Amino acid sequence: MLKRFPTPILKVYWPFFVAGAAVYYGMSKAADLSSNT
Amino acid sequence: PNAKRIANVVHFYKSLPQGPAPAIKANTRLARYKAKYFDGDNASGKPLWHFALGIIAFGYSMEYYFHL
Amino acid sequence: LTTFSLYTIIVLLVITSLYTLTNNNNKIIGSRWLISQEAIYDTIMNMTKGQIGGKNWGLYFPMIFTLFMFIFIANLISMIPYSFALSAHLVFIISLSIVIWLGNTILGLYKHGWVFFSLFVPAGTPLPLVPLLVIIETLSYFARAISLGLRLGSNILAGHLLMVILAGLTFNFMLINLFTLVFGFVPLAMILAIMMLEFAIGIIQGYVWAILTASYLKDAVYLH
Amino acid sequence: ESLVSKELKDLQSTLDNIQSARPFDELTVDDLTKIKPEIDAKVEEMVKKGKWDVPGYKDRFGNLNVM
Amino acid sequence: NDESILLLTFLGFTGLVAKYLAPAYKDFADARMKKVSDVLNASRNKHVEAVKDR
Amino acid sequence: FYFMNQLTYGFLLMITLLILFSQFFLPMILRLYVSRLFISKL
Amino acid sequence: MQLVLAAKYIGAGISTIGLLGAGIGIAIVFAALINGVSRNPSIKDTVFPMAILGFALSEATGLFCLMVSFLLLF
Amino acid sequence: MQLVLAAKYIGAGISTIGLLGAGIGIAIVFAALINGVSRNPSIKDTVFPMAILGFALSEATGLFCLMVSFLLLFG
Amino acid sequence: MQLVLAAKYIGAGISTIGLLGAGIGIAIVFAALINGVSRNPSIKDTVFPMAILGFALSEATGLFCLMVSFLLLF
Amino acid sequence: MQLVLAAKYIGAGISTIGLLGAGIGIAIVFAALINGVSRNPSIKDTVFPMAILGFALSEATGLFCLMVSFLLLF
Amino acid sequence: MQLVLAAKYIGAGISTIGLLGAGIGIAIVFAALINGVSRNPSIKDTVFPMAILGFALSEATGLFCLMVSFLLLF
Amino acid sequence: MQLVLAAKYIGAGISTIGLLGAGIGIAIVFAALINGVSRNPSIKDTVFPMAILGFALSEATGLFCLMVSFLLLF
Amino acid sequence: MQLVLAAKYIGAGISTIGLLGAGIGIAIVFAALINGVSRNPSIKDTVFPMAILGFALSEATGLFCLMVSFLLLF
Amino acid sequence: MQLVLAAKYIGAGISTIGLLGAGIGIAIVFAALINGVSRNPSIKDTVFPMAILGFALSEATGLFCLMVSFLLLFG
Amino acid sequence: MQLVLAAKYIGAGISTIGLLGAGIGIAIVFAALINGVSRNPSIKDTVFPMAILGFALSEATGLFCLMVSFLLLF
Amino acid sequence: MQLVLAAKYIGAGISTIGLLGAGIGIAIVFAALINGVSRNPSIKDTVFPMAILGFALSEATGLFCLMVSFLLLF
C-alpha cells in the first residue's frame, strides 16, 4: 500500500510539541481558574 | 563509460515485458469504487461531489437530529 | 458524541482520501488526482526554498506543509452548506496561532540564547533612539501572535456569517408579495460571486498562513 | 580475442528485449525498488539528511507550481 | 429552508465549477500527462538507442 | 466552556498530520520525484 | 437596557466605515499589478501571487472592522 | 422601543459611507487599467479580464457596508 | 415619539457622504482617460468603452448610496 | 416635534460635505486635462470634450448631494 | 424652539467642510498648471484660461457649500 | 436659553477644520513650484506669479472657512 | 451604569476605524512591491523579505486600535 | 452656564485637529524640496528659500487653527 | 457620576484613530524604500538604516496616540 | 461639576487625532528622502541636515496637537 519511511520529527519539532502541551496545560489552568463567570 | 551501460542492462533485464501483473480485477468492498472512479481512464471529479453528497446528507441529518 | 470530533474525523479521512485512493497502485505516470498533490507539494516547496533559504531548510518543510493542508482542507469542508465551520472558533485558531508563535519563540531561544533579543533591531539607527524600535514594534512581537490566527479566524467567521445572513436575507425578503422574485436575482448572483470569493478566502488565506509563518520561521531560526 | 564472443550477443539480446519489453506508460516503483534499491537508499539517506530539494529535476521536468 | 438556499447556490456553483474549471483542469492534466509520458518515452528511446552504439 | 474538547481533538489531529504527512505522504511523492530522476538521468 | 441595543446598533454603524480601508486598499494592489504587467508582460505569473497575497492581507483587514461590528451586532 | 428603530435608522446612515472606499477603489483600478492598455496596445485582452477580477474582487467589500445598511435598517 | 423621523432625517444627512468618493474616484477614471490619450492618441475609441464602463459601474456605488438615502427618506 | 425641524437643519448641515469629493474630483479632471495638452498640444479639440463630459457628469454627483440637501432642507 | 436656532448654528458648523474639497482641489489645478507650463513652456496661452475655467466651476462647489452654510446660519 | 452659546462654541469648534484643505492645498502648489524650478530652472517668472496666484486664491477659501468659524463664535 | 456599557459599545464603534491606516498601509506597501519588482525583475527575494517586514510593521500599529477595540470591550 | 465651559472644552477638542493640515502640509513641501535638490544638486540655495517660504505662511493653517483653540481657552 | 467613566470609554474610542496617519506613513516609508532599492540595489546598506530611522520616529509620534488613550482608559 | 471633566475626557479624545496628519507628514519627508538619495547617492550630506530639518519643524507642530490634549486634561 504505502512504504512507511522513518522521517524525523521527534528530535526535530520538539518546541511545537512542547508549545502544544504548554498551551494545553495553561489553558487547563485558565478554564479551571476563570470558568466561573 | 562502464556505469551507464551496466546500469541500463540491469535496468532492462528484470522489467516486465507487456506491462505485466495488470491487476484489472480486485476488490476489498471499497477498491471497486476506486477502479470505477479513480484509475487511468475516468478519474472524474464527481466522486468528491458524491462525497460532498454525504455531507449534503450529513449536516441535514444532524439538522434532522438538532432542530427538526 | 462531539460534532467537532467527527469534523476532525472528516478531515483525516479526506486527507487519507488524497493519497491512497489517489494511488492507482503506484503508477509512476502521476494521474489526474496526483497532479494536484504534485502541484501543492511544488508550490509550497518553491515557496519555502526561497524564504528561509538555509542549509537547514527542509527540516521544517513537513511542518510548513502540515500547517497548510490542515488549513487547506478544513476550510473547504464548511463550503458545504449543511455543515458547521471548523476554523470559525477564534478559540481554536488563536490557540493554533499561540502554539506556533510560542514554538517559534522557544525554537529561537533554544537556538540563540542571550542574544536572541537582537532580532528586535532590524538595522542601524543613531544612538539617542536605540531603545525606540524595540518597544516600537513590541505589539507586533506579541501582536504578531494574535494577528496570525485572528486574520484567518476573522475571515472564516465573517464569511460564514455572511453566507448565513445573506441566505436568510434572500429568504426573509421573499415572504412578501409575489413580485419580489422579479429582478431579485442580483442578490442571488451576488452571493454566488461571494462563494467565488469564498473559495478564495479559504485557499488564499491558507497560503497567507503558510507564507507568514514561513516568514516567522525565518525570523526565529536564522540570524538574518 | 575471446572478449567479444559474449559481449556482441549480449547487447543484441539486450536490445531484443529493449525493443519489446518497455512498460513505460505503466511502470511501477514497486518493481523499480525491487530491482533498484539505490532509489529508496538515496531517498532515505536524503530525507535523513533533509535535502528536500531534488537537484537536477526542474531543467527537464516542469515545476508545474502556482508560481 | 434557509440553508437549502445555500444548497441551491452550491448546486449552481459546483455546476459552474464543472462548467469552467474541471474541463480546464482536465485538459491541463492532459497537457502535463502528455508532457511527462512523452519525455519518459524519449529518455528510454535514447537509452535503447545508446545500447546499439557499443 | 468546551474549549477543551475542540482543543483536544484539534491538537491530536495536528500531531497526527505532522507525523502522518512527514513519515508518509511527502516522501511517497518524493519517491516519484527520484524515480523519474533516476529513470531520465539514467 | 432598551437604550443599549440601540447603542450597539449605532456603534455597529460607526464601525462599518473601517472597510473603507480595504475598499481603497485592494484596488491599488490590482493597480500596481496592472501598471507592472503593462511595462513587463512576462513577469505576470511571477507577480501574480505577490499581488494576490497583498490582496488577502488588505481584504482581510477590512474583514477585521466588520467582525468588530458583528460581535457588537450580536 | 421607540428609541431603538430611530437609532437603527441613523446606524444604517453611518454604515453607508464605507462604500466611499469602493467608489474610489474600482475607479483607481480602471485608472491603472487604462494606463495598462494605453501604453501597451496588445496587453488589453489579457489584463482586462484580470482587471474585471480586480473589478468585482473588492467591489463586494463595499457591498458588505450596505448589507449592514440593509439588515440594520430592516432587521 | 417624534424622535423617529427626526433621526430619519439626520441619518439621511450622515449617509449623504456615501457618494463623496463618487465625486472623486470618477474624476480619476477620466483623469487616466486623458492620460490614456495624451501619451497615445491612436488608442481612444478602444479604451473609451472601457472608460464609460468604469465611470458607469464606478458610479453605481454612489447610486446605491443615495438610493439608500432615498429609501431612508421615505 | 419642535426637534424634528432642528434635526432637519443639522441633517441638511452634514449633507453638504458630500461635495468634498466633487470639489476635489472635478478639479482633478481639468488637472489631468492640463497634463494632457502639455504633452501633446496637437490634440486639444479631442481632450476638451472628454474632460468636460466627465467633468459635468461628475459635478452632477455633488449636485445630487446638495439637491438631497435642498429637499431635506424643505 | 430655543434649540432649533442652536441646531441651525451647529448645523452651520458642520456644513462648513464641504469646501474642504475646494481647499484641496482648485489648488491642485495650479499644481498641474505648473506641470502644464514648466514642462512645455510655450503653452501659457493654451492652458491659463483653461486653468481658470477649471478653477472657477470647481470652486463653485465650495461656493454651494458655504452658501447652504449661510442660509442654514439664517 | 443658556444653551445656544454652548452650541455656538461647539459649532465654531467643528467649523474650524475645513482649513485642513487650504493647509494642504497651497502646499501642493509650492510642491509643484519646486517641481517647476528643479526640472526647468529657466522658467521662474512665468510660474511663480502663477503659483502665488494659486496660493492666494486657494488660501482664501480656507480663510472664508475660519471667518465663518469666528463669526459663528462671536 | 446601565449607560457605561452603551458607552463602551460605541467606543468600540469609533475605535473600530483606526484600521483605515492598516487597510491603506499594507496595500500601498505591496503596491510599491509590485511596482518595484516589475521594474527590476531579478530582485524578488531581496525586497520581498522586507516587503513582508513592512507589512508586519504596518500591521503592528494598525492593531493597537484593534486591541483598544477588544480590551475596552471585554 | 455649567454646561458651557464643558462645551468650550470639547469645542476646543474638535477644533484641535485642523492642524492635521500642518502635519501633512509643510511636509509635502519638503517632499518636493528633496526632489528639488536630489534631482538638481546646485539649486538648493535658490529653492530652499522658496521652500522655507512654502514653509512659513503655509504652517499658517495650523497656527490659525490652534489659536482658535486658545481664543476658546481663555476667551 | 457614572457619566465620567462612560465618557472615558468613548474618549478612549475616539482617541485611538490618531495613529491612522502613522500606520499610513510608515508604510509609505517602506514603499519608498522598495522603490528606491528596487531601482538601485547597491544602496540598501546606506538607506535601509536611514529609512528605518525615518520609519520609527514617524511612528512613535503617532503611537503617542494610544498612550493618550491609555492614561484615559486607565 | 461632574460633567466638566467628562467633557475634558472626550475632548482629549477628539483632540488626540490631529497627530494623524503629523504622522504622515514625517513619514513622507523621509519617503522623498529615500526616493531622492537612492537615485542620487552623492547628495546625502547636501540633503540630510536640511531633510531632518524638514523633519523637525513638522513633527513639533503635530506635537502641538497633543500638548493641547494635556492642557485639556490637567
From Swiss-Prot, chain A:
Family listed: Belongs to the ATPase j subunit family.
Topology of this chain in the membrane: Single-pass membrane protein
Origin superkingdom: Eukaryota
Keyword annotations from UniProtKB, A to Z: ATP synthesis, CF(0), Hydrogen ion transport, Ion transport, Membrane, Mitochondrion, Transmembrane, Transmembrane helix, Transport
Disulfide bonds: none
Transmembrane residue ranges: 9-25
Protein source organism: Saccharomyces cerevisiae (strain ATCC 204508 / S288c)
GO cellular component: mitochondrial inner membrane; mitochondrion; proton-transporting ATP synthase complex
Compartments (UniProt record): Mitochondrion membrane
Additional remark text: Present with 6540 molecules/cell in log phase SD medium.
A GO molecular-function descriptor: proton transmembrane transporter activity
Protein name, entry field: ATP synthase subunit J, mitochondrial
Function: Mitochondrial membrane ATP synthase (F(1)F(0) ATP synthase or Complex V) produces ATP from ADP in the presence of a proton gradient across the membrane which is generated by electron transport complexes of the respiratory chain. F-type ATPases consist of two structural domains, F(1) - containing the extramembraneous catalytic core and F(0) - containing the membrane proton channel, linked together by a central stalk and a peripheral stalk. During catalysis, ATP synthesis in the catalytic domain of F(1) is coupled via a rotary mechanism of the central stalk subunits to proton translocation.
Any one GO biological process: mitochondrial proton-transporting ATP synthase complex assembly
Residue span relative to the full protein: 1 to 37 of 59
From Swiss-Prot, chain C:
Function summary: Mitochondrial membrane ATP synthase (F(1)F(0) ATP synthase or Complex V) produces ATP from ADP in the presence of a proton gradient across the membrane which is generated by electron transport complexes of the respiratory chain. F-type ATPases consist of two structural domains, F(1) - containing the extramembraneous catalytic core and F(0) - containing the membrane proton channel, linked together by a central stalk and a peripheral stalk. During catalysis, ATP synthesis in the catalytic domain of F(1) is coupled via a rotary mechanism of the central stalk subunits to proton translocation.
UniProt KW rRNA-binding keyword: no
Subunit structure comment from the entry: F-type ATPases have 2 components, CF(1) - the catalytic core - and CF(0) - the membrane proton channel. In yeast, the dimeric form of ATP synthase consists of 17 polypeptides: alpha, beta, gamma, delta, epsilon, 4 (B), 5 (OSCP), 6 (A), 8, 9 (C), d, E (Tim11), f, g, h, i/j and k.
Official protein name in the record: ATP synthase subunit a
HAMAP family membership: ATP_synth_a_bact (MF_01393)
Effect of I136M: In strain: D273-10B/A1
Family: Belongs to the ATPase A chain family.
Stretches that traverse the bilayer: 1-21, 57-77, 90-110, 115-135, 156-176, 181-201
Record key words, sorted: ATP synthesis, CF(0), Hydrogen ion transport, Ion transport, Membrane, Mitochondrion, Mitochondrion inner membrane, Transmembrane, Transmembrane helix, Transport
Pfam family, one: ATP-synt_A
GO biological process, one term: proton motive force-driven ATP synthesis
Keyword Disulfide bond: no
Swiss-Prot record, chain D:
Domain of life assignment: Eukaryota
Primary localization class, coarse: mitochondrion
Coiled-coil parts of chain: none
Keyword Plastid appears in the UniProt entry: no
A GO molecular function held by the record: proton transmembrane transporter activity
GO BP of this protein: proton motive force-driven ATP synthesis
Keywords for the protein's UniProt record, in alphabetical order: Acetylation, ATP synthesis, CF(0), Hydrogen ion transport, Ion transport, Membrane, Mitochondrion, Mitochondrion inner membrane, Transport
Keyword Transmembrane: no
Compartments it resides in: Mitochondrion; Mitochondrion inner membrane
GO cellular component, one term: proton-transporting ATP synthase complex
Quaternary structure and partners: F-type ATPases have 2 components, CF(1) - the catalytic core - and CF(0) - the membrane proton channel. In yeast, the dimeric form of ATP synthase consists of 17 polypeptides: alpha, beta, gamma, delta, epsilon, 4 (B), 5 (OSCP), 6 (A), 8, 9 (C), d, E (Tim11), f, g, h, i/j and k.
Functional description taken from the UniProt entry: Mitochondrial membrane ATP synthase (F(1)F(0) ATP synthase or Complex V) produces ATP from ADP in the presence of a proton gradient across the membrane which is generated by electron transport complexes of the respiratory chain. F-type ATPases consist of two structural domains, F(1) - containing the extramembraneous catalytic core, and F(0) - containing the membrane proton channel, linked together by a central stalk and a peripheral stalk. During catalysis, ATP synthesis in the catalytic domain of F(1) is coupled via a rotary mechanism of the central stalk subunits to proton translocation.
Family the UniProt entry places it in: Belongs to the ATPase d subunit family.
Swiss-Prot record, chain E:
Compartment(s) where it occurs, according to its Swiss-Prot or TrEMBL record: Mitochondrion; Mitochondrion inner membrane
Residues represented out of the complete protein: 88 to 141 of 244
Protein's job: Mitochondrial membrane ATP synthase (F(1)F(0) ATP synthase or Complex V) produces ATP from ADP in the presence of a proton gradient across the membrane which is generated by electron transport complexes of the respiratory chain. F-type ATPases consist of two structural domains, F(1) - containing the extramembraneous catalytic core, and F(0) - containing the membrane proton channel, linked together by a central stalk and a peripheral stalk. During catalysis, ATP synthesis in the catalytic domain of F(1) is coupled via a rotary mechanism of the central stalk subunits to proton translocation.
Biological source species: Saccharomyces cerevisiae (strain ATCC 204508 / S288c)
Annotated protein name in UniProt: ATP synthase subunit 4, mitochondrial
Gene that this sequence comes from: ATP4
Miscellaneous: Present with 12900 molecules/cell in log phase SD medium.
Oligomeric form and interacting partners: F-type ATPases have 2 components, CF(1) - the catalytic core - and CF(0) - the membrane proton channel. In yeast, the dimeric form of ATP synthase consists of 17 polypeptides: alpha, beta, gamma, delta, epsilon, 4 (B), 5 (OSCP), 6 (A), 8, 9 (C), d, E (Tim11), f, g, h, i/j and k.
Record family assignment: Belongs to the eukaryotic ATPase B chain family.
